[PDB]
Each structure stands twice: as structure tokens, then as C-alpha cells.
Design a protein around this ligand. Structure first.
Ligand SMILES: [Mg+2]
Ligand SMILES: [Mg+2]
Ligand SMILES: [Mg+2]
Ligand SMILES: [Mg+2]
Ligand SMILES: [Mg+2]
Ligand SMILES: [Mg+2]
Ligand SMILES: [Mg+2]
Ligand SMILES: [Mg+2]
Ligand SMILES: [Mg+2]
Ligand SMILES: [Mg+2]
Ligand SMILES: [Mg+2]
Ligand SMILES: [Mg+2]
Ligand SMILES: [Mg+2]
Ligand SMILES: [Mg+2]
Ligand SMILES: [Mg+2]
Ligand SMILES: [Mg+2]
Ligand SMILES: [Mg+2]
Ligand SMILES: [Mg+2]
Lengths: 91, 91, 92, 91, 91, 91, 91
């Protein structure tokens, strides 16, 4: 258990494909334990989704690749957890 | 083994009849479904807004949507999707 | 064996009598009912609005509705339903 | 066997005497009462408003009512009732 | 496990002695398992404190004596828990 | 044996130097101190207000106050205190 | 031995480049560090404000500060410090 452990991505995307498709593909990466997609807000042609990815030594670029290949773009990385222990934010 | 779509939060519109209970039962009788939670969002005239949370393993979206429509329901939005081996909650 | 209806949150309106502790007792005595929670939402002139939470296994809605209605209450709406092997909570 | 009335929350009005500690002790001394919690809601110039939560097995309402009345208090309302094998919480 | 188990007191006391001593003396009473003193507000010559006393079969008169013999006064009993099971107030 | 001052929540005022890191460090090296948490409440032109939480057994206030003093800090108030065999939280 | 600085929460300012993932990775690769959490507070024109929480044992601040500065980061303030054997949370 090392490297990138959890990422929270601010992603913008068209209506297609559906977020279940995004979720599935991402979840199928080998170093990924689970993926959560939260619909932030849908608009006229786009959709704003918050993706939480849990894993072990996650390959950002890989993750960004799957996302972009499906027409989505990453607007920002909101949270990054790295290491042996999943450290939560102290608000 | 646990994989695929694990949880779906669905925004659904439907007529008073049949009652949410039938939906819950029918959805819960699906093969990979562990459980189903149907929360009433708001009642209107001849209409009813519910939030459907379906937990299970490698769930079939299409099979779920099918059940719902087969009962006069319609899916307005997919609010949250969880996929993978571990259930990940939104940060 | 866990299956069927597992939990219901019923919005019920009823005259003052019988008291809610009687609704609770009667509902709790039903077979397959693990427990019952009756929350008082508001008291009116000659009526009360109460929230009923029923836990159990493979619950029979009609039977539960029967008890509530035999008792003088009316179900205005089913606010929550849970069905299946696992009691899944609502994600907020 | 665990059954009957399991937990009550009572809206009680009482004179300043006797003290809430006397109500709590006396009620906790009842045959099938596991515990009692008295939360002071408001002290008025000649009376007080308390919320009495009583936990137990097959609780006797009339008996609990009696103890409260012999002590000079009166039950204004029954806010929550729990009954059966398991203690269920409101959702 | 019988009698008074928890008490929450609204106490008024002059600046001296320090709460550090209240908590310390009270914690030293026979049937007390622990004491939590929370500072509500401090004024020009006094301060309002919240005393949480946990234990088994607590003696109110003893505690009250210890409080007064130190200069503080009990303005009110905010919560009382009696019995075999520590029952929290249902909100 | 677990007794006396168990936890303290200290409101402290101190010049920017020495840094809170040194404060936490020297306090944590005290005899019966299990751990220390220093929370920066507010920085000012020449001073900063921190909240200090000290966990341990039969803690010595005089000692704690001493160390804080020596580094130029000052205890403005004692917001919370726990004493006794068991750690009791406020209700 | 479980001692010293256990957890730190640093308010940091930095240019968009390099990404926060590299910071999170590099800080997690430091000896003594069990895990790192970088929360995005805000993105500005040429800058970015992040809150970094570091967990581990007997952490070296000067080392952490260096890694950050070596990457263009700057520590505007140390918001929380935990030191000792047990991780203590702010009350
Ligand atoms: Mg919009
Ligand atoms: Mg409407
Ligand atoms: Mg009304
Ligand atoms: Mg009304
Ligand atoms: Mg209604
Ligand atoms: Mg209703
Ligand atoms: Mg009232
Ligand atoms: Mg009044
Ligand atoms: Mg009043
Ligand atoms: Mg009332
Ligand atoms: Mg004042
Ligand atoms: Mg005052
Ligand atoms: Mg007062
Ligand atoms: Mg100031
Ligand atoms: Mg200021
Ligand atoms: Mg700005
Ligand atoms: Mg700043
Ligand atoms: Mg700052």
C-alpha cells in the first residue's frame, strides 16, 4: 500500500456516455478498489460529476486517459491521499 | 465475486399507482440485488417523486430501468453510482 | 430467511384515540415484526400526525395497513420502504 | 422474553418539587425499567417542563403514569413509543 | 448498577477556585467514575460551568455539598440518568 | 492507576515564536502525557491564539502551566477539564 | 517508539505547477510518514491554496517544509499540530 490512494476529481462531461459507463471503466483499472460518481449538476449539453477513486498506487495519467477518452475533461483535483494510511482531511 | 455496478441512486418520477412498495419488492427480487431503499421525495397531483437506492453486485442497469418502466416509472436522473469491489462513499 | 419488505416509514393521521402506545403494541405483536417506532409529529384539535417505523422480515403491507386502519388511523403516505436481504439506508 | 412497550419519551409538566432526581430514581426503581433519562426543557416560575425517556421491557404505561402523578407531575404528551423485540429508531 | 448514574449541572461559581479543582475534588468522591467540567461563560466576577458527573448510584446531597463547600452553587439539574443502563435523551 | 486530571482544553495566547510545533513537542514530553493537540485559533500582528488539548493520567497542571509560561505563552482560560478513572465527555 | 510530531495540518500556497499529486506523492515517500492528504481550498489566477494533512511518527518539520519549498510551495501557516504517543483530536 503506497503511492496515490484516493482522488476526488471535479469532472465536466457531455451527457454521453452515461456516468455508469464512466464508473464501470474506471472501476476496471487494476489498481482500483472502488469508484464513486456523484452527479453535481446537469446542464444543457454537459454534466458536472464528482468522481472519488480509491486504490493502491493509482496511475493518475491512466485515470485521466480513461476519462478523456470518453469525452470528459478534468476541471480540478479536489483531494489527493497518498501513502500507507488513508488520511482524512482535518477541517 | 464482487465487481461492476454496486449501488445506484435514482431520481424517478411515477404515478401514485402502483405504490412504491411494489417497486421495492420487484427491484429487490432481482438476482444480484442485495437490497433496495425507496425514499419519497415529494407527492404531487397524480405524480410522485422518489429516490431509489439499489445495492448489489454487478447490477444490470438495463434490467433495473426495465423493471421501473414496466411499472409506469421513469428515470429522471442517476444521482450516484458506485462501482468496483469496495463500496466507496463520496468525500 | 431475510427477504421481502424489511422496513416501512408510514405517515399516519389518526384521531386522538386509541393512544399511540396502543398502535405500537398492536403492530409489534404482528408476526415477523422485529420492532416498532411511533413518532409524534403534531397534535391537532382532535387529530394527530404520527410517523411509524416498522422493522422486520418479509413484512405483509396489507396486514400492517389492516392494523393501522382497524385502529382508526389512515396512511397518508409511505415515506420509506426497504426490501431485500440487507437493510439499505438512503444516501443523502 | 423481550416484548411490549420498550421505550417511551414523555412530555411532563411538574411543580419544582419534588426534584427531577426524585422522579428519575423512583421511575428507575420500577420492575422492568432498565433506565430513565430526565432532560430539563424549561424552568418556569412555579413549574418545570421535562422530557422523560424510559427504557425497559414490556413497560407498564399506567404504572409509569401513576408514579409520575403521585409525585405531582402530569404527562402532557407521549412523543415517542418503541415496542417489540428490537429497539427501532425513527428514520 | 442502580440509582443515579449521570448528572449534568448548571453551576455558578466565583473565579476561585479553578475548575481544575472542582473536577478534581468531585472526581475523588466514592462512586464517581469521571467528571467533565465545561466552561460555558466567564463574567466579571463569576463563571457558568457545565458539570457532567458519571458514576454508579450517585449521592446528590454529597455532590451538592462538595460544590457549595467550594463556593459554587447548583443553579439547576439539566439532565439526570438513573438505572442500570445509561439512557441518552431521545431528541 | 487511572486518576486525577485526564484531559485539559487550554485557551492560550503566545507570540509567534517559539512555534506551536515546539509547544506541542515539549508538552508531549511531560511525564504522564499521552498526547497533545494544538489548534491555531487566530493569528494576529504579534500574537496568535491557540487551543491546547492535553491527554494523559493524573496530569500536573502546575507543570503544564510552567512549560507554557517558560516559552512566553499565557493561559487565558481552561475551557474544559476531565478528571477521574474514566474520560467523560460533555452532554 | 511512537513519539514526537504525529500529525500536521499545513496551510500552503503554491503555483499551479507542479500538480498537487506530485506533492502528495513526494511527501508520502518521506520516511516516518504514514500518509498524506491534500485538500484543495481554492484555485486562483496564478496560484493555488491547499490544506495538507500529514500523518506519521516523529515527523521532521524542516524536512517536510523543504520538500514543499523545493517544489515551489510555501507554508503560510501551521493550523494544527499533534504530538506524543496517542493521536489527540481537538475538542
Ligand atoms: Mg446549472
Ligand atoms: Mg410540488
Ligand atoms: Mg396544527
Ligand atoms: Mg396539522
Ligand atoms: Mg400528512
Ligand atoms: Mg406524508
Ligand atoms: Mg409541552
Ligand atoms: Mg417559560
Ligand atoms: Mg413554558
Ligand atoms: Mg407535547
Ligand atoms: Mg456574560
Ligand atoms: Mg452570566
Ligand atoms: Mg445559570
Ligand atoms: Mg485575537
Ligand atoms: Mg484578529
Ligand atoms: Mg479567490
Ligand atoms: Mg492561507
Ligand atoms: Mg492559514
Amino acid at each position: 500500500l503506497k503511492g496515490l490512494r484516493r482522488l476526488v476529481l471535479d469532472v465536466l462531461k457531455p451527457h454521453e456516455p452515461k456516468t455508469i459507463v464512466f464508473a464501470l471503466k474506471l472501476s476496471e483499472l487494476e489498481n482500483v478498489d472502488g469508484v464513486n460518481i456523484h452527479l453535481s449538476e446537469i446542464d444543457q449539453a454537459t454534466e458536472n460529476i464528482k468522481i472519488t477513486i480509491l486504490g493502491n498506487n493509482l496511475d493518475y495519467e491512466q485515470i485521466k486517459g480513461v476519462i478523456e477518452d470518453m469525452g470528459g475533461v478534468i476541471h480540478s483535483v479536489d483531494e489527493v491521499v497518498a501513502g500507507k494510511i488513508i488520511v482524512e482531511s482535518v477541517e
